[model samples]
Target: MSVGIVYGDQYRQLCCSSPKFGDRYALVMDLINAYKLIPELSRVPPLQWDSPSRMYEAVTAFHSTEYVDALKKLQMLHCELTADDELLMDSFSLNYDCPGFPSVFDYSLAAVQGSLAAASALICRHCEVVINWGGGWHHAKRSEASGFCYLNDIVLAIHRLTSPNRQTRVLYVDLDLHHGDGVEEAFWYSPRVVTFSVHHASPGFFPGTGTWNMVDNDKLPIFLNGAGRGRFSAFNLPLEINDLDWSNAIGPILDSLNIVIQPSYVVVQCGADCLATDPHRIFRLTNFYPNSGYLYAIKKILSWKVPTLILGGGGYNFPDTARLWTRVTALTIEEVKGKKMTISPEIPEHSYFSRYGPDFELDIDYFPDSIQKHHRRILEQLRNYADLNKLIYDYDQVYQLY
Candidate 1:
């Protein structure tokens, strides 16, 4: 019955200057502030664990020595490049998405602190659900940075939990607009871990590898293509829930949880960038809003079905992200607690200093009418895919693993 928000004054220092970064942090604050706005839902102040020294201990618990050393290098590079402004440090040159910051050491360490806080909450706080607004840097690899991520907090948390006790089964579910590349790579060959991701695919998209058949006892692309690529070593498979049918998607998640994971623990990365208003990536469907997906996660946790650590990720739309998470807060406490809501909350104006706030668009000029039509078509496709008696079943049986 406890909801933990992992924000403190120092946690805000983890901010970097990307069009999406500031917007996401701004919404994080707004969600924390929303407790004051709508007091009917239960809300608690975030437990503070902001010390970088403590953070280092937690991160070193799981990360490779080489990866940690590389982070130190990136940290120094960040300081050397953007000595004047903390935000502009993200402007550094990198062929990938690692957001360079003024003090990469500090932010990476701070994210480590946040992840520990979330993991500890699950262990001690008796928390049925907890969302670490600071965690979910899912694209980070053991010794390399990619996809706007410099650390893999999700992996570190799981490592902290299941490392000493390898008997524990952990299910890591990610709904970022991009793949859960880092977490998958970290656990690619381990049967103890079940990693699932739903994201964009094809030509110019991030790393481009989340095909359904990518599953096996081992060996799946975290980035679809990479140097630190994992090989088939254990009874683990990386499954992609991309371009799914809404009605059917949850079934697969549940089935995987029941069959492969046998999960005693759950870690969900609910990235908001996969939602409708997200400015980062593209998807075909619109029926699966962040609210609906989040509610499903909370319900899954509540069934005592499993001990869960719910975390937020990838929501770059300020006002929309704020709205999405606030609703999550309400549902986690009020609705799931068997209460009734009488009114809808007000929407926030676009975030301050956000390029995609009110006017900017990506991949398309504006929200075209065709986009909605396509979204509907995609949802129907997903529904058909889930239906065993449908034509999609025959097609999928032939395609078998697509």
Candidate 2:
């Protein structure tokens, strides 16, 4: 299978270009180079770096034109900060979580290009699989930005996939520590796109709206106590891990999904914040010798052999984030007898090699917490729900075969 990767230095520098995540793409790309995965990638279409009009036309499909215009205006007036501009930015949630950083429009637009190009490639049969290490800003909503995302790239790509063939079944799997709320909301009632979010969900957590399980409430006993809420084709697996084992619940959950839905196309939002090393301190995915839950989950999804699109999301610890995606890049292209990724555990020496210090290896040293190992039972309970023959019958009934 031909795999396409969306990347370029210009698009890389335009996104989250702060002291925190500004250089993340650079590191990720360098690692991609150091690992020599670039040559293995198929020739996906290039990003539209200078196409502002195309960006707006595409964004206006889901988000309001007013919101789109405001972002472009912010980019136009980057050096100018009028009181009204600040108010507009604040109203759109751009002042805070989505900030009005310089070139906000171009950055988000550039980010959109990579994913769109990759999606278009898949839709037109240009490539069977595509990975956009730069996309997956799933927190951006229809009218507002949240969680450092100003554009909903995941939703757009899925829309592109379904627009051509109405019967197209697209499954969106969010493996972020934070919920893929915006994408979930976008496809809330659409049977064509099934959004299965595996995130850290609890009371008072950031945008915590993925709780739909009576199992997690009673079995885990850490979150709310109520019957789970349900959506048409939307399912949420609120996850928590205190240890690196990841409870071994997600693999079964994923298996259940593969059997039940069996999507025509799959999009995985790989947010590195779920790693134990992230500042969020929610999930405990490690990057050590033994593959963590994140990598394991990716392997499980890829093994399905469904045409997949892998996108980048929340990852604060940049170097390990790069490490994670570098390995992911390798996984996407490298062919082995088994699902095992054929790459070294050691970090290759690149320009940003010094960033990975102390251990200086691919592993993110484990940082322990106490979210409880009992969450596994909750996942197992959910697994039972998905595995039922009833679900297979119900999927046909509930799924929108448009």
Candidate 3:
């Protein structure tokens, strides 16, 4: 029941100088501070910082060398642009508009190495549970950088762990707002990985790839709908708030996981952008409580008895994101008793938001109004999931899970 966290100033420095990056760091730090508050966090074993591993060099086992090189160049170029005016360079990252980004090569390598170190600790069983707040770079591809990512760290982890003799099938669960296109792309033609992405897939989103029919490789499984698509796998209601047929949307994916392709390992990458407060994307995750998604995923993993590896991803709302991650750190401690945590003074509320906020110094006294509602709805649905006594849909309605 030990847990490990991979973090350092290096993770904080991987920036396009945007509020998103600063806020994400803020969230990372806040979670760390929360870990400090818990009495149990002191027990987990530790892992190294920035251990040497490369996208093509180390990650090439999972990704193409060409894609790694291109991403590294893109990241280096982005970092250089940020250095010129870190405070103002965020705009460049926002619109995908270039701001004199000379080369992104160096930074890309740094992220790959950092992410691999985090993932390796889990693969090697260095700790029973590990949380890499800096990894889960899911949008990087074989030869291109999509979204805000430059390398698919999750893929790198799988690559580093998977052996020809092992033939380890990985259950790739992504809770990010956008599809895990990069990770999916790297293994698109293989049946070694099963990617389960619950993202905002309506029109006008970034990358735009998660559809029920678009199960790229690995005898994939998919459920196409918007927003509350996770409801099926999750213990919850048949219908979504907007009257979307969530039962029809998410039921089959859950069926496939429960009945098909039972994986030996589970890699759950929980991203914060699906949170209602995240300004980065438009997926409204009712359970954006940072660690809440991980908490929920852990329940399922526990049932399966699979070796599970969890990673952090896409939390853009700084202070709030930090708050969420802190909760996650606390939850990772099995003895923490899963109680709602109080905000600790050690956590600097201003660290995340002030770096880019209208009210930089304001302490997070409560969750945002929108976030509270979102969480409430998500929890309610999850309640339905946990209690199967309550039927999610009428018996006549297509036998959603039957």
Ranking by TM-score: 2, 1, 3
User: Model 2 compared with the native: what TM-score?
Assistant: 0.83
Summarize candidate 1's per-residue lDDT along 1-402 as a digit string, tens digits: 445556666676564434336646655565446345334422323334458565456566656565665567666775634453333333332323565556666666666667767777777645655666666788777656676667678898888663464366676777666777778777876655657665665555667555334445676433231122222211122222232343244444344334333566788777777665566546432322333555565555446456666666676655556555655555555533456443233333444425333433211122324233433333333333234212123333222222
For all predicted structures, in order, the TM-scores are 0.68, 0.83, 0.64
Per-residue lDDT for 1-402 in model 3, tens only? 545555555445653333336446545655466345434442222233344462235656665655554444444555534443443333223225222243344434445555566556667666555566666778866544556565567887776554454445666777666677777666555454656666665555566675534556987544332223223222211111211222223434444453344556677777777555566535333333332334455454545655566677677566656655665566555422344444443444433434435443223332434323433444343344324323233323222333
Ranking by lDDT: 2, 1, 3
Candidate 1 to native Cα RMSD, angstroms: 9.1
In model 1, the runs with Cα more than 4 Å from the true position are: 16-20, 35-57, 80-96, 162-166, 212-244, 284-291, 301-305, 340-343, 348-402
Candidate 2: residue 393 lDDT (0-100): 38
Give the Å shift of residue 395 in candidate 1: 23
